């Protein structure tokens, strides 16, 4: 409690010296109330116009267009201590985990260099971030915060509140955050080949192929359970078994990162806007409150020691969960040792998100571990048994499923996929506004590049990416304002792109030929692609496609007498 967050509050109660109120009227019962001062402020999606003119017939899809319109009664809940057992479990695949992470990686310090180059390559006292980064004041504000965190007490890092919660801090708290715990992220602690769970910078091209990997284990069905509001249910048993990362670290890093988990992580302060509009400070210990990429690395750690330890239940590696016998330590120990490795291979886990297919359907019915670590499940009974996938191909993972496709020369793609009305929906909304005709063109021309390459076998996807490609002057370079491997953020030609990420640097194609034409890569079948939602089919699609070059004609005429490529007779329909 206060002896740790008392000088942050102490800090804003006097910025605030002619406002400070013990309201009575305050909505909290979970969240600790300290105080309320005076404030008054809030963005919403703004459309992308040069996406929505290439594609007209979705102008009457509601699933489209109302994406592009307009429970906070969930972070005032409490997850309940788990059982003696249950925190012996955690404790132990915890430790084993760090060890195993940490078999092949040095934990090592992130430097301002790093973090200077990042926010100038794009990932109130200033403006912008941009120029704090070169205003040497700001970084002896650091330097202060900093020797206070060597002291273990902190003043300035705060958290801003605002199934999506994001709680930014002023720049200062997120270079110490980086400084103590970016190696997780900027070293690939969660990659593949490191963690063997992780997909960390794998890339949509990779996630089916790693699916179709996992398949081929012999085991049961193919599990994908997703946990309701999993930042809320980070329990402070959680929060301490993340911070035995430091105990892999040294000399000054070590306590640099101490400093954040007890400090920021494992106490909080928030300030939160309440229209009635003042800001409430309020604390608690749990839940999940870092910045958005520690947040990924940290959930995906305490999500797999989670599915570890369901395995476990299903296979009766441990018999009840209120107490640990020492035998049952002893049995949990060595069979980390014995099959640990092989088990994470079995799954694939992206922070919240996890595939498992477990050694049998046993892990189906096994819910007491997984349920009192409070990752209880969406959308099913607490204690119903999970419903399994029989096919890979059907399995939910990162928003998407994959298909598996032959090309005309027998090579085999495994293909990334979702309804084709959430991808056109997403490529028509445009984040923050003051954007130019320019800045809205080259924001368009990423989505029809990333379409290019990753949902080429979508046949509307194709030919609006191609429009969109048409339309936008040939030189111009693809934007974006929140930065997953992103392959088409550049200039280069798509079809070599293309060549590069689905064949040369493909490794489950051991056939290196290039493809030489678009027309060499296939699509979907027809009933498969209106499956997952093509208009292939309909008279408002089939005028849109034959009437292309004028949509087309429309949008250059928009942005005036600039250098264009028609990329349309790609497509053999248009090859004249
Ligand atoms: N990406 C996150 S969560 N933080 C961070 C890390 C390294 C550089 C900048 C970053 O902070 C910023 F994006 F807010 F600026
Ligand atoms: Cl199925
Ligand atoms: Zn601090
Ligand atoms: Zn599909």
Same mark, same amino acid.
């Given at each position: 409690?206060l002896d740790?967050?008392?000088?942050?509050?102490?800090?804003?109660?006097?910025?605030?010296?002619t406002?400070?109120?013990?309201?009575q009227?305050?909505?909290?019962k979970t969240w600790?109330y300290?105080?309320?001062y005076?404030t008054?402020?809030?963005?919403?999606?703004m459309?992308?116009?040069?996406?929505?003119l290439?594609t007209?017939?979705?102008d009457?899809?509601?699933?489209?267009?109302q994406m592009?319109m307009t429970?906070?009664?969930?972070?005032d809940?409490?997850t309940?201590?788990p059982? !003696? &057992?249950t925190? @012996? *479990?955690?404790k $132990?695949?915890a430790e084993w985990?760090? +060890? %195993?992470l =940490?078999?092949?990686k040095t934990?090592?310090?992130?430097?301002?260099?790093?973090?200077t180059?990042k926010?100038r390559?794009?990932?109130?006292?200033?403006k912008?971030?941009?120029?704090?980064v070169?205003?040497?004041?700001?970084?002896e504000?650091?330097?202060?915060?900093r020797?206070?965190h060597?002291?273990?007490?902190?003043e300035?890092?705060?958290?801003?509140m605002?199934?999506?919660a994001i709680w930014?801090?002023?720049?200062?708290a997120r270079?110490?955050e980086?400084?103590?715990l970016?190696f997780?992220?900027?070293?690939h602690?969660?990659?593949?080949?490191?963690?063997?769970?992780?997909?960390?910078? !794998? &890339?949509l091209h @990779? *996630?089916?192929? $790693?699916?179709?990997?996992?398949?081929k +284990? %012999?085991? =049961?069905?193919?599990?994908a359970?997703?946990?309701a509001?999993?930042?809320?249910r980070?329990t402070?048993?959680?929060?301490?078994?993340?911070?035995?990362?430091?105990?892999?670290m040294?000399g000054?890093?070590?306590?640099l990162?101490?400093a954040?988990?007890?400090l920021t992580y494992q106490?909080k302060?928030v300030?939160?806007?309440?229209?009635?509009?003042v800001?409430?400070?309020?604390?608690?210990?749990?839940?999940?409150?870092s910045?958005?990429?520690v947040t990924?690395?940290?959930?995906?750690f305490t999500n797999?020691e989670?599915?570890?330890?369901?395995?476990?239940?299903?296979?009766?590696?441990?018999?009840?969960?209120?107490?640990?016998?020492?035998?049952?330590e002893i049995?949990v120990?060595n069979?980390?040792?014995?099959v640990?490795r092989?088990?994470?291979?079995?799954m694939?886990?992206?922070?919240?998100?996890?595939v498992v297919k477990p050694?049998?359907?046993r892990?189906a019915?096994?819910?007491?571990?997984?349920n009192d670590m409070?990752?209880v499940?969406?959308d099913?009974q607490?204690?119903?048994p999970?419903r399994?996938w029989?096919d890979?191909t059907?399995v939910?993972?990162?928003?998407?499923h994959?298909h598996?496709?032959?090309?005309k020369?027998?090579?085999?793609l495994?293909?990334?996929?979702?309804?084709?009305?959430?991808?056109i929906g997403?490529?028509?909304?445009?984040?923050g506004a003051?954007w130019?005709?320019?800045?809205?063109?080259?924001?368009g021309?990423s989505?029809?590049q990333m379409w290019?390459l990753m949902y080429f076998?979508?046949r509307?996807?194709?030919?609006?990416?191609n429009?969109?490609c048409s339309?936008v002057?040939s030189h111009?370079?693809?934007?974006s304002?929140?930065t997953?491997?992103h392959?088409?953020?550049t200039?280069?030609?798509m079809?070599?792109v293309?060549?590069r990420?689905?064949?040369q640097?493909?490794?489950?194609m051991?056939?290196k030929?290039?493809?030489?034409?678009?027309?060499?890569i296939?699509?979907?079948?027809?009933?498969?692609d209106?499956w997952?939602?093509?208009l292939?089919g309909?008279?408002s699609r089939?005028?849109w496609?034959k009437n292309i070059?004028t949509?087309i004609?429309?949008?250059?005429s928009?942005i005036?007498?600039?250098?264009?490529?028609?990329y349309?007779?790609?497509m053999?329909?248009?090859?004249?």
């Amino acid at each position: 409690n206060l002896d740790i967050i008392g000088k942050r509050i102490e800090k804003i109660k006097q910025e605030h010296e002619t406002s400070w109120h013990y309201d009575q009227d305050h909505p909290y019962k979970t969240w600790a109330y300290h105080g309320s001062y005076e404030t008054k402020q809030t963005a919403s999606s703004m459309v992308n116009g040069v996406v929505r003119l290439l594609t007209k017939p979705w102008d009457i899809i509601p699933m489209v267009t109302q994406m592009a319109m307009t429970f906070k009664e969930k972070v005032d809940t409490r997850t309940q201590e788990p059982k !003696e &057992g249950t925190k @012996k *479990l955690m404790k $132990i695949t915890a430790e084993w985990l760090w +060890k %195993e992470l =940490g078999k092949k990686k040095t934990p090592r310090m992130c430097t301002r260099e790093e973090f200077t180059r990042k926010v100038r390559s794009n990932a109130n006292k200033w403006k912008s971030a941009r120029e704090a980064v070169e205003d040497s004041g700001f970084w002896e504000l650091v330097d202060k915060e900093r020797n206070l965190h060597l002291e273990g007490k902190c003043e300035t890092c705060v958290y801003n509140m605002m199934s999506r919660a994001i709680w930014y801090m002023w720049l200062g708290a997120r270079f110490l955050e980086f400084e103590a715990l970016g190696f997780l992220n900027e070293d690939h602690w969660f990659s593949r080949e490191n963690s063997l769970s992780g997909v960390e910078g !794998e &890339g949509l091209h @990779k *996630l089916g192929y $790693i699916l179709r990997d996992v398949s081929k +284990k %012999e085991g =049961g069905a193919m599990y994908a359970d997703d946990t309701a509001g999993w930042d809320t249910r980070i329990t402070l048993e959680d929060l301490k078994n993340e911070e035995m990362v430091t105990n892999h670290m040294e000399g000054e890093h070590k306590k640099l990162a101490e400093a954040i988990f007890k400090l920021t992580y494992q106490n909080k302060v928030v300030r939160v806007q309440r229209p009635t509009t003042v800001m409430d400070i309020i604390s608690r210990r749990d839940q999940r409150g870092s910045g958005q990429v520690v947040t990924y690395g940290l959930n995906t750690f305490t999500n797999m020691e989670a599915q570890l330890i369901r395995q476990m239940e299903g296979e009766g590696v441990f018999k009840s969960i209120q107490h640990l016998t020492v035998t049952e330590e002893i049995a949990v120990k060595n069979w980390l040792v014995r099959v640990g490795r092989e088990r994470l291979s079995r799954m694939a886990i992206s922070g919240d998100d996890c595939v498992v297919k477990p050694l049998d359907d046993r892990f189906a019915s096994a819910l007491t571990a997984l349920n009192d670590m409070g990752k209880v499940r969406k959308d099913i009974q607490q204690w119903e048994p999970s419903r399994g996938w029989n096919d890979w191909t059907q399995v939910p993972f990162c928003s998407h499923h994959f298909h598996e496709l032959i090309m005309k020369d027998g090579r085999v793609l495994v293909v990334p996929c979702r309804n084709q009305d959430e991808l056109i929906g997403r490529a028509r909304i445009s984040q923050g506004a003051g954007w130019s005709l320019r800045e809205t063109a080259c924001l368009g021309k990423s989505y029809a590049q990333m379409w290019s390459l990753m949902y080429f076998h979508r046949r509307d996807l194709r030919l609006a990416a191609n429009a969109i490609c048409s339309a936008v002057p040939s030189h111009w370079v693809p934007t974006s304002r929140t930065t997953a491997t992103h392959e088409w953020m550049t200039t280069e030609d798509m079809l070599t792109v293309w060549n590069r990420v689905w064949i040369q640097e493909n490794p489950w194609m051991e056939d290196k030929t290039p493809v030489e034409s678009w027309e060499e890569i296939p699509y979907l079948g027809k009933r498969e692609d209106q499956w997952c939602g093509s208009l292939i089919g309909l008279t408002s699609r089939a005028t849109w496609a034959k009437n292309i070059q004028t949509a087309i004609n429309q949008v250059r005429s928009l942005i005036g007498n600039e250098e264009y490529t028609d990329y349309m007779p790609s497509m053999k329909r248009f090859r004249r």
